Amino acid sequence: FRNMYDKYRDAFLSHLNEEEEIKEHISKYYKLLFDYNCLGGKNNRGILVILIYEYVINSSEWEKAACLAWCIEILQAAFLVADDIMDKGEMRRNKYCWYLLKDVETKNAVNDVLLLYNSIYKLIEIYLRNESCYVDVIATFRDATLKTIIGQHLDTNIFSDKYDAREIDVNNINVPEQPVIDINMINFGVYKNIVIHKTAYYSFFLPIVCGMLLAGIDNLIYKKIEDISMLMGEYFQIHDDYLDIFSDIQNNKLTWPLIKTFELCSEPDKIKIVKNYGKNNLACVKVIDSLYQYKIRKHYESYEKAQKAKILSAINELHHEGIEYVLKYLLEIL
Amino acid sequence: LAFFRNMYDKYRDAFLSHLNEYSLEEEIKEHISKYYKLLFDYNCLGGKNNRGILVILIYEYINSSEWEKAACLAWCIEILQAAFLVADDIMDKGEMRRNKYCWYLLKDVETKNAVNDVLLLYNSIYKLIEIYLRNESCYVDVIATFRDATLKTIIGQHLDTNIFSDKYSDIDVNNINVPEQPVIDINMINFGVYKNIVIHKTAYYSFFLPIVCGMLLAGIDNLIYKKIEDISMLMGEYFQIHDDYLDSDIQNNKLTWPLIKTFELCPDKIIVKNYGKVIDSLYEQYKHYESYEKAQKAKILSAIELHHEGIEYVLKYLLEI
Numbered sequence: 186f187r188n189m190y191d192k193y194r195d196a197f198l199s200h201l202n203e204e205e206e207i208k209e210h211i212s213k214y215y216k217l218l219f220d221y222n223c224l225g226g227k228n229n230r231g232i233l234v235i236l237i238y239e240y241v242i243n244s245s246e247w248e249k250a251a252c253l254a255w256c257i258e259i260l261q262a263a264f265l266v267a268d269d270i271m272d273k274g275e276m277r278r279n280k281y282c283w284y285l286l287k288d289v290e291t292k293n294a295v296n297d298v299l300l301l302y303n304s305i306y307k308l309i310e311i312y313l314r315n316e317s318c319y320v321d322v323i324a325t326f327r328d329a330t331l332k333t334i335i336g337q338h339l340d341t342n343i344f345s346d347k348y349d350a351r352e353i354d355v356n357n358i359n360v361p362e363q364p365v366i367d368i369n370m371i372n373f374g375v376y377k378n379i380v381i382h383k384t385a386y387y388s389f390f391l392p393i394v395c396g397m398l399l400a401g402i403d404n405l406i407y408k409k410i411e412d413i414s415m416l417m418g419e420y421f422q423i424h425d426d427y428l429d430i431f432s433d434i435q436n437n438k439l440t441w442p443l444i445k446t447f448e449l450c451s452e453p454d455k456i457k458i459v460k461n462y463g464k465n466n467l468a469c470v471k472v473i474d475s476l477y478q479y480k481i482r483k484h485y486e487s488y489e490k491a492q493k494a495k496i497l498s499a500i501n502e503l504h505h506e507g508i509e510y511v512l513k514y515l516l517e518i519l
Numbered sequence: 520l521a522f523f524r525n526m527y528d529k530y531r532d533a534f535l536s537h538l539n540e541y542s543l544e545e546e547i548k549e550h551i552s553k554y555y556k557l558l559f560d561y562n563c564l565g566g567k568n569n570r571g572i573l574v575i576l577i578y579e580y581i582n583s584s585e586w587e588k589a590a591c592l593a594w595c596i597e598i599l600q601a602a603f604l605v606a607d608d609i610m611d612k613g614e615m616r617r618n619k620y621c622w623y624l625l626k627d628v629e630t631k632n633a634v635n636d637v638l639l640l641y642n643s644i645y646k647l648i649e650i651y652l653r654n655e656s657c658y659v660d661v662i663a664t665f666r667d668a669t670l671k672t673i674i675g676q677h678l679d680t681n682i683f684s685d686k687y688s689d690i691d692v693n694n695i696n697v698p699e700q701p702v703i704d705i706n707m708i709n710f711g712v713y714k715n716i717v718i719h720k721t722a723y724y725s726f727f728l729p730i731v732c733g734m735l736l737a738g739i740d741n742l743i744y745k746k747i748e749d750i751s752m753l754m755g756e757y758f759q760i761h762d763d764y765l766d767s768d769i770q771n772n773k774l775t776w777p778l779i780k781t782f783e784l785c786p787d788k789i790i791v792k793n794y795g796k797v798i799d800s801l802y803e804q805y806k807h808y809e810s811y812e813k814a815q816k817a818k819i820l821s822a823i824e825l826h827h828e829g830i831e832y833v834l835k836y837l838l839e840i
């Protein structure tokens with residue numbers, strides 16, 4: 186996989202490359218945009234396409250599968266660039282975030298998101314325009330992205346001022362909304378709504394469905410895969426929330442640990458939480474951290490056991506030895 | 520007409536419905552709606568709608584089902600326009616757009632949302648086209664037209680943003696310290712480059728796309744598309760240049776027509792010390808626009824050798840308005 190990279194980068198660079206001085210500057214820039222942001226990640230989404238396809242093969246077919254696999258990694262790159270803009274991040278994959286670079290800046294990074302994003306659909310035209318799944322593939326990418334955009338919306342706004350059912354001041358361009366958690370949003374239903382949309386569709390559903398469509402599978406097994414994907418996304422974002430404890434607390438994010446602590450702590454501790462969650466002051470966080478007291482460590486281990494079981498149960502009702510093997514596999518390496 | 524402007528709520532609500540069919544909780548769905556209805560309303564309405572009407576005109580030159588599909592494409596262009604405006608304002612750090620505050624400036628919105636909202640508006644387009652034209656034979660071609668124009672636009676934007684920048688000289692992935700102070704580069708101050716920028720940044724999506732949209736839906740592939748591409752390239756220029764004439768362009772260190780015309784014509788070049796912060800008085804110093812508009816209008820009418828009385832009429836018409 187990691188070998189095929191240059192081929193797809195260059196095919197798109199080629200597309201762009203049809204005044205000479207200008208063409209040359211464009212290339213130096215866009216090659217870096219690709220290299221800087223597409224390489225360096227673990228590539229789980231990418232390999233998943235290749236694995237699922239394999240288990241459901243001449244060189245031409247790999248060419249097409251590896252294309253889809255790389256298009257996922259591009260999508261990922263686009264999301265990381267955008268998310269770092271939005272969250273005002275510092276570090277990503279142990280380098281500076283793209284937008285932070287003096288030769289890049291926020292102005293270019295925005296434009297670059299749209300570029301990466303659209304690059305995907307061009308590469309799919311180059312390699313799969315004639316395949317019968319073509320239209321379905323481009324649709325999968327579109328629908329997964331839309332779901333991701335909504336999941337991102339929610340994650341950004343769940344505790345925000347705009348969330349009665351007061352509307353938006355199209356005249357207030359000044360003053361800020363003193364980041365303040367909203368106890369009404371601190372429940373599992375909402376969290377799942379965010380986590381499923383923000384991560385499950387593009388991290389699991391998309392790659393699997395890509396590998397399945399190319400292979401010729403529409404059939405009632407896609408909805409089975411959607412549900413497994415929903416389950417995996419949760420299992421997994423929640424894992425991530427467990428680690429980012431050992432910026433989210435100051436970044437005022439809805440996390441699993443936050444919700445578990447809330448449904449579990451005494452009416453007086455809930456108030457401490459509200460006074461310290463998301464605020465700048467270090468005493469405030471050193472303290473949420475100490476509330477995590479309710480042995481969140483242990484409550485995770487309990488959830489991981491139970492959720493892993495829910496995931497395996499749904500996989501065994503799939504009736505496809507090849508896909509079952511891959512998903513059992515990914516659930517070990519995820 | 521304002522028949523077009525009437526169809527608006529239908530397409531906005533179709534896409535809002537799509538969202539409202541997601542696996543979410545009712546309270547959450549309600550907030551989502553409130554927000555996205557505003558994103559559409561605030562950014563899609565208020566414009567002149569030339570790109571929109573162009574689709575409807577070209578197509579016309581018809582039962583209700585056909586309008587439904589053509590007005591879809593027409594609105595999709597206006598949504599595209601909305602997304603480009605939102606994005607451009609973030610990039611150029613703008614203040615006012617259509618005589619209100621820019622979307623991203625709003626305290627309930629901020630840069631963090633606006634970015635995400637550009638992607639949402641953009642993708643909304645392709646969903647609307649699935650809804651209204653999934654079964655049409657031109658479907659695949661239509662979605663590609665939108666894709667290719669966007670890509671050209673994106674490149675045009677890249678150029679417009681960077682033509683005078685530090686990296687364009689005869690990238691440091693470790694420098695994150697406030698950017699270099701902006702300086703024009705005399706090497707870039709020529710017509711070739713400017714047409715490169717203006718063609719890509721505006722011509723494909725403002726002219727080519729809406730015309731090709733009206734053409735594909737109508738059943739025209741044929742060798743007349745490349746004719747339309749060229750007219751479209753020409754109009755793009757004719758028109759960005761007009762906008763340069765009305766023109767914070769000097770202040771924003773932008774490559775403009777007046778800048779290039781003055782440069783090829785003017786010790787005065789050493790412009791370099793004041794552009795991007797008297798430039799104004801260098802312009803009244805050196806009428807040349809009125810000369811170009813007469814010549815370019817002629818070049819455009821001459822190309823409209825199209826052999827199609829219906830299309831020719833509309834293009835002659837748009838060139839007036």
Ligand SMILES: CCCCCCCCOc1cc(O)cc(CSc2ccccc2C(=O)O)c1
Pocket residue numbers: 225226227228229261263264265267268277278333334337383384421422425635638
């Ligand atoms: C339109 C707005 C875009 C919204 C998209 C939000 C993106 C955040 O969702 C994520 C959540 C996670 O838990 C993990 C990851 C990637 S794994 C990863 C993580 C860090 C570094 C490298 C990698 C790597 O393997 O490539 C993504």
Ligand SMILES: CCCCCCCCOc1cc(O)cc(CSc2ccccc2C(=O)O)c1
Pocket residue numbers: 296299565566567568569570600603604606607617672673676720721725759
């Ligand atoms: C993602 C890459 C970023 C893309 C950036 C593309 C730049 C888009 O900005 C513009 C370009 C133009 O050539 C003209 C206009 C104003 S026309 C207009 C203005 C306000 C209302 C209605 C209209 C109308 O003619 O319908 C704006």
